[PDB]
Design a protein around this ligand. Structure first.
Ligand SMILES: N[C@H](CCC(=O)O)C(=O)O
Ligand SMILES: N[C@H](CCC(=O)O)C(=O)O
Ligand SMILES: N[C@H](CCC(=O)O)C(=O)O
Ligand SMILES: N[C@H](CCC(=O)O)C(=O)O
Ligand SMILES: [Cl-]
Ligand SMILES: [Cl-]
Ligand SMILES: [Cl-]
Ligand SMILES: [Cl-]
Ligand SMILES: [Cl-]
Ligand SMILES: [Cl-]
Ligand SMILES: [Cl-]
Ligand SMILES: [Cl-]
Lengths: 256, 256, 256, 256
């Protein structure tokens, strides 16, 4: 075990930067390698078994880079590839399904929103009983176009969330992009606790890695970005979501 | 040589069924092979050179199936791969850029809307001078989510089309999906001629094929669908856009 | 852990059946999944980093089949991928480099023959000091053509082995195919102990698995053959190497 | 339309340099792009349909470099991909099957040797009636090992050609490597005319391009080497075959 090594984080694109930010806030001295599979984004409308294979090849790439842990920041890739990926690999592997499902278990009536793949996967029912679950495809592009505070967002939120139970006490924001929409989602579902995948996973990663002696108290915190599509396109989209991307390199889908 | 052979049509997914529909209306006796690359949809956010390689791959597949002609129904793939693909192949090859650019030449001030790849490609400026061009990313998912006639669509159209020159005379709808949004776009850009890629291309294909003796006079029209992703997922989405998919099978990306 | 689960064995092709046969002789109750990557055979002239990525891909596939252990039967893939693959994965992972290198440390002067990739990798020197190493490219095709008892095999053996040091005590047969050449190689190097990768690895697998409590004490083993190329071509070539392939199916490289 | 443009030549690897050398002898003014698919060599043991797909990929790549003509120097890839590749493409496309098969039609009894894929393909029989056909797998690695003039070459030739009909008049050397084995083949098959693919194809290319007005009358053409595997490995194999390669670039299989 080498605490000097980086933590790998991966997602289909820029959305997983919500998970990276939450991690960096808790672990300001860790080195992160953030991998965005922008050549094959989005994952949410692909076959779950195809996404599972993507996760395997990206995990191997991150292990060849020397990481001491892997975070699956994507809710679709977590749904497709966990728990098995964590069972199959020696390094600690963390995803974004279990921590929010665990928190959800302290409510009686729980909902899930996410991509098509995520809601159809059955991943969340493995860990928490769900009263209601709804795929919300337009949420991701609405966020990537910068419109989370626009009334279009409130109108789209109404279109997806109107028919949710009056019962609901909690809603899992089971997609990387949904923290940007807490405003609109909350306006449409007053009272309902909103469970943020990034914050609850960041907490679990920081806890578990401390527990195992894998953190580096002497480190200088920094992030390197690796993408499969065009680096400048990524950097521009990341800036629209409020992330300054300093170092980015394109990784060949051949290197996988 | 063989007018009994099918016409190949390809796109990234279901959006190109607007081109298929316009073609079938003008050529009800032809056999069509419609190829939707749903494993790698969408193309609009990919590198143009990557889309160009996809098109080469899919054209080869269609030629091995025995097609007598190829229609690139996708505006992004047309932008990436034409005119070179038509120069490189013996069979007649048609796209959705040139016919609408041609029609646009009968106007003094022309606009273009499309995907990021399409507007940034410069494909359209090669055939027609443009006063204004604008990438409209949210239009595709808005259409696939069935919302093209809802208030949200008018608001999204306003968001993208507000800064359009007051003196525009025509707008190229340079994306497979955008014929669904004529109401919302017209309401926001009253007075502007909206040029439909599907109908103008289907007109050109029917003309050129008759002119070369490649139409099948006495055939019984039908369509076979080929997709690289899940066939049932595709059949469901095609119905949401008003196409009844009867015969579909999955083509392995290894088959390419 | 479940001892009724199969053991995964993988190679580039038919050569690895030498390892499967030895394994099955020692472990007649175990179920084996033998994976032959015949779409991409041979490995010996490919870049080591490319073979390393193949190994990762195939290990993931085997893990998705539920194996309780993995044997890398190929000396080229072992050289490319081990020890890291065993460090990175939770199931026991065995290769064909370490057991013979271990046996070799009981001799003063040790040689190695194998593919180009194997001899240039430096995998064997990590475990045993070598006096002489030679790549022998024609050996593999000689075996696959069934000529190991022909005089051409003696002449080719001489071509490769004549300049070996006359004080050599042991020779590592560092390639799946080379047990078929024991006669010829022994003729040309009388008195040199020939260390056979299949037998020594099988011994280690049986040893290690018993110590872990992972062997199945009841029931009767079977073999399932999985190849990435044409199954009838594989069956024909295996028959020449003396294996009667019962169950074989083609796995798509897209399943990988 | 531009005779300064290069001529593309492709093969699985170094074997095709026999075709390149014959071309350059006849056409000292032409620029050549020689493409060696060393990442995926050899083709002779792969499914024909797989090789056909490789040929399509590499052809598109060469068209993106601006070639004015394509020569398929590989007999296996010619067998897999022609004549359809020539029919499907606008630029002149030449292979190594037809010219030797044409020359063979001036003989009563004709045999064929080549790879497994070539012999199984039935490519030659569509152009010339064959009395005998035999796959000769060991010939390629024998040549690449530099053993073509040695006694072992004679014995391998005897092993393959022994059962050849005594009344043969001509034998098609249907593989890139076989010109190196004329000595051993002719010693075993005295009195049989040996038809050389490289010389008969280069002859046809020069004739056809001249008649088409595509030759550059003022050129001082160079050769560029492009390979999908490791350039240095390629350079060293070429040297074993008597070609000094200087300018070689690695082309990613992802560029295809
Ligand atoms: N990252 C995905 C959203 C975007 C995608 O579909 O790839 C998720 O968390 O579900
Ligand atoms: N068919 C594409 C739209 C969907 C995509 O981005 O692939 C186009 O016409 O531009
Ligand atoms: N299995 C390989 C030999 C055949 C190949 O080169 O793939 C090895 O043992 O090195
Ligand atoms: N170039 C091949 C021989 C090497 C290979 O099998 O790829 C041929 O002419 O058939
Ligand atoms: Cl995949
Ligand atoms: Cl979705
Ligand atoms: Cl777009
Ligand atoms: Cl104009
Ligand atoms: Cl609305
Ligand atoms: Cl080798
Ligand atoms: Cl062969
Ligand atoms: Cl050169």
């Amino acid at each position: 075990k080498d605490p000097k090594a980086p933590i790998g984080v991966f997602d289909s694109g820029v959305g997983g930067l919500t998970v990276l930010k939450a991690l960096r806030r808790l672990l300001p001295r860790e080195e992160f390698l953030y991998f965005g599979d922008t050549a094959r984004v989005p994952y949410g409308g692909k076959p779950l078994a195809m996404v599972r294979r993507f996760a395997w090849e990206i995990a191997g790439f991150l292990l060849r880079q020397g990481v001491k842990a892997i975070v699956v920041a994507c809710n679709t890739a977590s749904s497709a590839a966990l728990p098995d990926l964590a069972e199959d690999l020696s390094v600690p592997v963390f995803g974004v399904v279990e921590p929010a499902a665990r928190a959800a278990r302290g409510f009686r009536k729980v909902g899930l929103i996410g991509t098509q793949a995520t809601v159809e996967s059955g991943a969340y029912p493995r860990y928490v009983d769900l009263a209601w679950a709804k795929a919300c495809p337009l949420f991701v592009p609405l966020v990537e176009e910068g419109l989370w505070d626009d009334p279009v967002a409130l109108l789209v939120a109404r279109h997806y969330l109107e028919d949710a139970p009056k019962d609901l006490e909690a809603l899992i924001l089971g997609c990387t992009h949904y923290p940007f929409l807490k405003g609109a989602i909350g306006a449409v579902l007053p009272g309902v606790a909103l469970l943020d995948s990034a914050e609850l996973t960041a907490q679990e990663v920081a806890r578990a890695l401390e527990a195992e002696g894998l953190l580096n108290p002497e480190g200088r915190g920094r992030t390197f970005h690796l993408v499969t599509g065009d680096p400048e396109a990524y950097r521009a989209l990341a800036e629209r979501l409020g992330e300054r991307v300093e170092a980015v390199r394109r990784v060949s889908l051949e290197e996988l």
